[PDB]
Structures are given as C-alpha cells and as structure tokens.
Design a protein around this ligand. Structure first.
Ligand SMILES: Nc1nc2c(ncn2[C@@H]2O[C@H](COP(=O)(O)OP(=O)(O)O)[C@@H](O)[C@H]2O)c(=O)[nH]1
Ligand SMILES: Nc1nc2c(ncn2[C@@H]2O[C@H](COP(=O)(O)OP(=O)(O)O)[C@@H](O)[C@H]2O)c(=O)[nH]1
Lengths: 426, 38, 50, 46, 426
C-alpha cells in the first residue's frame, strides 16, 4: 500500500531499469506477456507497490522512462520484459544528449522535463500513497547527469516529504570511458547533495572487479553489471513487498543511516556472491554472509572502507533466520574493530529481517554503509576537475550554451566543502 | 623476535591461569581476621 | 628518430628503477617500525609476567 | 572493628612488601631491557 | 570438536595427499561425488574433524593444495576422488620453483605466501577447536622444502600453541632424482628443527625396499608408495574419529614421545603388510602384529634401528583387542631387547587401542619410534652437503638469487648439532 515510483533516465539508467524490472517482475511471478502466472499467493499481496492492474490482468509497471534519443527506447522495448512498460511512459526527445551538461540541464531540460512532469504527476495521482521516489540514472552522461538532476530538482520542489533513493553511477580513473566526466560529475553532485535523501553510489570498476573475483566470470559485460545492480535494487525494497520478523521501511533506513542531513552518500553491497563453479561448496550461513559483507572486495563502489571509518551501517537479511545469530554477528563484527567505526555512536549497525529470500536462493542480505572513506571517490573527480579547468579545457561547449564559469567554480567549491566535512568527521 | 614475543605472551597466560586457580583453590585472606577473633 | 626513441626509452627505464626502489624503501621502513614496536611489546610482556 | 584497624595496617605493610617486590622487578626488568638493546645492536651491526 | 587442517606442498605432497583423501574418504564411507552412501553411523559420528557440510550432504575436505605449477593441480583434479576439493583452495602460480630453494622460499614463496595464508586462515576460522595442522611435503625440492618451510613458519608466527605433523619425504641418495638434494634438505631441516613439532621422516629407499621384500610386487609405481604412506597417515589419527578403550590424541602422543625440547623426528611403521598370496597363510595374532611391527625391515626409514637405542616408542592398535595382551606384548619386547632402550627412562613404550580397524583389515597397528638411529640419515645427507659445498658447486643459482655464503655454513652447524644431540644421548 506504500507506493514506490521508479524514474529512469540516460542510456545506463534505461538499461539498469530494464533489468531491475526484469528481476522484480520474475520474482512477483508475472510472465513476459503481462499477465500473472506465479505459483505462491504471498507475492500477489504487494504487487501494487510496483504494478497497476489496467483491465484483464495486464499489469503495467509504475515507471517513467526518459532520454533525449529514441535509440534507447528502441532497445528498452526490444529487450526481454519490454512489453510491460506502459506506452505512455516513453517520454523521449529527438536531438540527443551530446554529453554536455548544458544541453542536459538547461536547453533540453526546459522542453523535456516540462513534458515529463505531466506523466510523473499523473502516475502519482494514479497511485494512492506515495512512500517516495526511486530514480536510477547516471552521473557521467548528458541525460542522466543533467536532465535527471533537473528532474530531481523539480520533483523535490513538488513533493517535499517523500524520500528519494538516487541510484547513481559515477565515473572512475581506470574505467574512464569518456573525456568530460569531471564536468558532468561535479555539476550533478552539487544538486545531488542538496536535493536527494539516500545517494546509492555505484561505479563500473567495482562491478568488474566483483564479476572477476567473486563471480569468477570470464567475459563480464553490462548485462551482468546491471543484473547485480538489479539484485541490490530489489533487496532494498524487499521489506515493503514481503512481511518478516522485523520490517524496515525506507524512512526507517534513512533515520537509522543518516546522522546529518547532508551526510547521506551511502555505499552498497550484495551478499552472497558465489561462483557457479563452486556453488555447492560454500555454506549459506549468517557468519559466512557477514564475513562476505564486511570486506572491501564486495563493496559495489571504488572505496577502500578500511581506509576510513564506518559512521553507520545497515544490513537487510532475507530468509527464515534467527535474529539472535544475526545481531550477535553484527555485534561481534562491531567489537572486533572499534577503530573502523566512530567513537560517539553506540550500535553503529542496524539490522532488519524478512522471511522470503529472493528466487533462486534461500538466504540473502544487502549491506548499506554510511562511511567516511567515500570522500576519496569525490576527491579523485575534484582533482581531475581542478587540473582540467585550470586551463579552460573543453569549457566552450558549456560557456556557449548559457553557462558561466561561476557555475563551475561554485560546483567545485561545493564538492570541496562536502569532502572537507567527510574528512573532518574522522 | 615475534616468535620470542609470542612465547613470552603464552608464558604470561600460563601464569595468569596459575594465579586464578590458586585463588579459587584457597578461597572458593578475609579468614585470618575472624580466625584470630575466635 | 632512433635517438629520440632511445632517449625516451632510457628515461622510462630510469623512472621504473626509481619506482621499484621506492617500493623497497617503503617496505624496509615498515619492517624497521614493526621490529621496534615488537621490542616494545616484548618489554610490556616482561612487565605483565612480572 | 578497632582490631581490624590493626589488620588493615597489616594489609598496609603487605602493600609495602608489594612495593618492594615492584622495585626489585623494576631493577631486573631494566637490566633485561638494556641486554635486549645490546643484543639487537650487535645483530644490526653484523 | 578437535580439528585438523591438511596442507599439501609440492608435487610429492599433492600426490600423497590425494591418495590420503582417497583412503580416508572411503574409511568414512563417502564416495567421490561427496554424498554419503556407507553402512553404519560410527563413520559419520565424528567426521567433522576433516570434512565440512556444504549443501545437504555434500562433504568437502579441509585440505589446501599448493604449489607453483598448474599441471600438478590439473592432474590431481583429473584423477579420481579429486572432485570433493573446494576449488577455492586451489592456489598456485605459473612460473615454477624449479628445484630452487631461493625461488621456493624468497621470491615465489614471498609472492604466494600472503595469498595462501588467506585460505589457511579461512579454514582455521571456519572451525571451532584446532588441535594441530598436517603438512605433506618433501625435503628435496623447491615447492616442497622451501615453500613448506616458509608456510609452517608463517603459521607458527600466528598459532603459537598448536602442533604440526610435517610428513617429510627425506631425499635418499640411492633414490635421488635431482642433482642438488642436500642444498635443499639441509636448509629445510634448519627450520624444521625450529618450528615444526612432529616431523615424520619417510624415504623412498625404505618404501621401495618394503614393496620389494614384503609386498612382493612386480611393478611398484608411486601409487603403492602413496598407498602405504596414506595408510600410515590415516592410522596415526584414528584416535579422534573413532572411540577406543584407551584413547590417546595428538598432544598425548607428542608429550609421551618427545623427551627433550628438540628431539622430534619420528620413524614410522605399519602392520600388517602382506602379499595377496601369503595373506591366506598367516595368523594376525597380537604377538605376530607386534613382531612384524618391530621388524627392522618394516620401519619406513633407511636407518636401521639396530644402529642405536630407542629413546621411546608408541603403538596404535586398531580393532577390538585385549589391552592386557597389548601391554604384555610390549613388555616382553622391551625385556627381550632391553639393550636397545634408553636406561634413564623406565617403560620406554606407550600403547593405545581404537575399537575400529581400517576396513577390510579386521585388525591393524601402527608404530612411531623415536630411536636415535635417525642420526644416520642426517649424517648421510651432511656428507653429501659438505662434499658439494667444499667447492661451491651449483651455488650461484642461490647466491645470485639472494643468499650469502654464511647461511649455508650456519645451516651446516645446525644440522651438525642436531645430529650430535642424538649421539650425545645414545
Ligand atoms: N555499469 C554500467 N554502466 C553503463 C551501462 N551503460 C552505460 N554505462 C555507462 O554510464 C554512462 C551513462 O551515460 P550516457 O549513456 O552517456 O547517458 P546518455 O547517453 O545521455 O543517455 C556511460 O558513459 C557509460 O559509460 C551499463 O549497462 N552498465
Ligand atoms: N612418494 C612419492 N614421491 C615422489 C613422487 N614424485 C616425486 N617424488 C619424490 O619427490 C622428490 C621431488 O620433490 P618435488 O615434489 O619435485 O619438490 P619440488 O621440486 O619443489 O616440486 C623426488 O626426490 C622424488 O623421489 C610421487 O609420486 N610419490
């Protein structure tokens, strides 16, 4: 009954969402055509959080899709579980992003977001009780970084109370697949810090390292990375869709994980991640899940958490579980290393349980940590921005489209003060 | 050097156990006062 | 052209040698620190035994 | 009790014996620390 | 409750351990697939000392293979019973030590030891109560001597209250297969006397003589030598997995055998070993088992115990038996051969009984002697080491790779005083 609305923007956002709806639809048991052909009757009870019955059981997912070129909507419709998306939810442009934050957020924003707010508001009226918004987009692009950010501004201006999960991927040195990442990263993070509520930050090098080390894959690709991100995005909302020994709503996650309003850039990881070669050797037990969680090699972001201090953390668990073993593990891990957690907070770790594990498993978890070692993520982009902007590199694409260098300087200043705040709380 | 340190730590643990067991055996010093008073 | 390429490759080999030398220096400094703190720990162990 | 105040001074003299033991151990441990420094110095030189 | 983790170093160790698991898995009743299909419950009742349950009746051994080549591991996997192993334990490089102690202890050992300690830590943490480790290796190679020595030293710097059973296949001259055996053997025993706590001496010379004389085999390949060694290794440690009238575990054996803080080099036998023609024409009485057990042409060592006194001895019988018969047998042996026993130790011999014999053999026994004849093997390797080292033959392969000359001389001195202590106490 607590509604969730999903917003997809950018090519990466569209692909990630087309995989996330894949996982959610298959686990609630709706077949590709759009009807309901599940097995158990416990999944039927909460399909309203993500789906609307139109007429005759043709469930339509409650999602908004946006971009600037039809070359992504074509792929979205082509891919599996493509027919489910309501055809009214394909707001697309005609020009293209161009990787310029100016085109993303100022020029095309005016003629696209004004048109997509109609769809999002109609969806909000169609659903009854909005719990919040979940938006999956990009920070290294033109549509997700700029147009998605301006849409975030407009949505927060409209609904102040609702929470916002911002599933955002960020650029990286080793996997820098384009040459103006710093600009479109700073100009997006400046609004993201002020305007969002839970920043789920991801990347590509972390996902590749996961698919190489933990999953032992041979040729990992965007399909696999998006599958992992989908698994996390389903685990984060498992609680609203299924009952359990101790429920955990989105506002509860925010309250237990945020000690200061602008300190809300979390880092997420999944568990268990085991190879198909050695599926039948490991033991799906709480100590093993917690050992796999609390380590750098599983975090889905380029952060070395042991080079920082976990301010807070949260652990969702799924499966017929004993909260006694769960919280003794969460306390033993906390007391082994008191240095890596902050001094002035007792019980740095929140735990929650649900009684239905995901399809294809029997026992799972999801770790969301508010650490202070995530400052170096933004530090890399900040130093790249300084080096590039000191010589006005590529600056004309921005300063010829209604933008002033004051914007660049202030965005850099905001990133600097945020990273200073993280560094201070250590 | 670490080998020597570990050996010394083990010796310290052994002496700890010895002291605690001697305490448990004897008591199970506050007895001399009442002994003399009687 | 060959002399230009030669000079470039020689300079690269040089910076490689200082790279590995810096790695070794860092490791040896770590080891010396570990040795001295282990001596401190052995002194503390003697005190505890006493 | 009044007699206990004599017993508590027996305990005080026992604590004085404890201080004497502390001093003896301090002397021996300082000598041992110097010996350890000597052995480590000779090892480093060699 | 007690736990043993088994580590295999080098090709010799890997083959011996593979055959050992092939034997012990059968003695516990589990097939190569990993699913129990035996008969009784006395097997399953204490298999937790070796195996871990994975997922519904899939038992995985607690063993770690390790070397510097992929070919040996490929052979082990291709062989039978190799499936049970967890693929995560398979740690290896690609270059190869090449019978070089410097490679196996300083370069490749350094570059693999940090990785291997991770997996040994995982196994030693997944357990509940450790009593000691097992290591299988040679003393005449690079991946086995130097790397095994580095591994056991790294273990000792971490678990300073535990034993290791290091089964060392000593390089025999008449069965030598590489040009520099002593340059490895001396430099391995240097630290074997310092760190390992129960070094079990074995030699291909004695194994081949046993096979030729007793077994009357025609074509003894390494299979049967590994079979004998595995039978000994599985028999030494049945006091844990099986309940006996007089139970004696590893620490009891160690304290009974080792009289002085550095005389841990055991010479080992096993009974009954028969040809399949004479197994129909013999009686397996307890006196007969004892006589074969003390038969000097049955100990797995090239040093004939007639060349010295016995510091002490231990016997481990298997099968329902008579404890008085055991004790009177050993008393008769000691009284008859009183000249071979140390005078300052009354009743130099220890006896233990387990109520389960190895399957097939309705009765069996094992012998662990600490005789002073062990000095023969060490003088017989020291002669070769000095003979080579007088003119620094084959020495540049180590000096150029990082070893000064003084280390070899210090190893010589340590070997000399090790071989001199036995002479002193004889
Ligand atoms: N992990 C991951 N990253 C992606 C995927 N698709 C695209 N990306 C990256 O995310 C960024 C998304 O920005 P972009 O595609 O240019 O946005 P748009 O072109 O304006 O719609 C790109 O620069 C890609 O490098 C994906 O499926 N998985
Ligand atoms: N029992 C047994 N011994 C072996 C086998 N293969 C080799 N050896 C012995 O092991 C020694 C070689 O040790 P090795 O495993 O090569 O050590 P490495 O050179 O470091 O790899 C030789 O002296 C052989 O006698 C085998 O299959 N079984």
């Amino acid at each position: 009954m607590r509604e969730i609305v999903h917003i997809q923007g950018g090519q990466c956002g569209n692909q990630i969402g087309a995989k996330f709806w894949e996982v959610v639809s298959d686990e609630h048991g709706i077949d590709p055509t759009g009807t309901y052909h599940g097995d158990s009757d416990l999944q039927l009870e909460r399909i309203n959080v993500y789906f609307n019955e139109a007429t005759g059981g043709r469930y339509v997912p409650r999602a908004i899709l946006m971009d600037l070129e039809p070359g992504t909507m074509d792929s979205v419709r082509s891919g599996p579980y493509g027919q489910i998306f309501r055809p009214d939810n394909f707001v697309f442009g005609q020009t293209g992003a161009g990787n310029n934050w100016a085109k993303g957020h100022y020029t095309e924003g005016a003629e696209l977001i004004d048109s997509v707010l109609d769809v999002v508001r109609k969806e909000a009226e169609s659903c009854d009780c909005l719990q919040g918004f979940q938006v999956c987009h990009s920070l290294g692009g033109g549509t997700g970084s700029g147009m998605g950010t301006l849409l975030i501004s407009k949505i927060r201006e409209e609904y102040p109370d609702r929470m916002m999960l911002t599933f955002s991927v960020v650029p990286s040195p080793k996997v820098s697949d384009t040459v103006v990442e710093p600009y479109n990263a700073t100009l997006s993070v400046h609004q993201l810090v002020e305007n969002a509520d839970e920043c789920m930050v991801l990347d590509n090098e972390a996902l590749y390292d996961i698919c190489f080390r933990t999953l032992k894959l041979t040729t990992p690709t965007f399909g696999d990375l998006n599958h992992l991100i989908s698994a996390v995005m389903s685990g984060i909302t498992c609680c609203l869709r299924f009952p359990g020994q101790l429920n955990a709503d989105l506002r509860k996650l925010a309250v237990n994980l945020i000690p200061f309003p602008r300190l809300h850039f979390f880092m997420v990881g999944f568990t268990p991640l085991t190879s198909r070669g050695s599926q039948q050797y490991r033991a799906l037990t709480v100590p093993e899940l917690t050992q796999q969680m609390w380590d750098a090699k599983n975090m889905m972001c380029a952060a070395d958490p042991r080079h920082g201090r976990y301010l807070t953390a949260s652990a969702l668990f799924r499966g017929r579980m004993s909260t006694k073993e769960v919280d003794e593990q969460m306390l033993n891990v906390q007391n082994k290393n008191s240095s890596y957690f902050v001094e002035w907070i007792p019980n740095n770790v929140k735990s929650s349980v649900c009684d239905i594990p995901p399809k294809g498993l029997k026992m799972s978890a999801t770790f969301i940590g508010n650490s202070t070692a995530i400052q170096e993520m933004f530090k890399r982009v900040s130093e790249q921005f300084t080096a590039m902007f000191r010589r006005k590199a590529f600056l004309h694409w921005y300063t010829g489209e209604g933008m002033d260098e004051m914007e660049f300087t202030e965005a850099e200043s905001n990133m600097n003060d945020l990273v200073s705040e993280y560094q201070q709380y250590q | 050097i670490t080998l020597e340190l570990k050996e010394r730590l083990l010796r310290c643990e052994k002496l700890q156990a010895k002291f605690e067991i001697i305490s448990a055996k004897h008591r199970g010093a506050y007895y001399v006062i009442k002994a003399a008073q009687e | 052209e060959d002399n230009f390429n030669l000079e470039g490759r020689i300079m690269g080999d040089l910076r490689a040698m200082e790279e590995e030398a810096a790695r070794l220096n860092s490791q040896i400094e770590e080891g010396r620190g570990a040795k001295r703190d282990t001596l401190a720990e052995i002194v503390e162990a003697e005190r505890q035994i006493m | 009790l009044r007699q206990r105040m004599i017993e508590e001074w027996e305990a005080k003299e026992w604590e004085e014996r404890e201080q004497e033991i502390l001093s003896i151990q301090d002397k021996r441990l300082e000598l041992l620390d110097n010996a350890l420094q000597v052995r480590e110095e000779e090892l480093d030189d060699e």
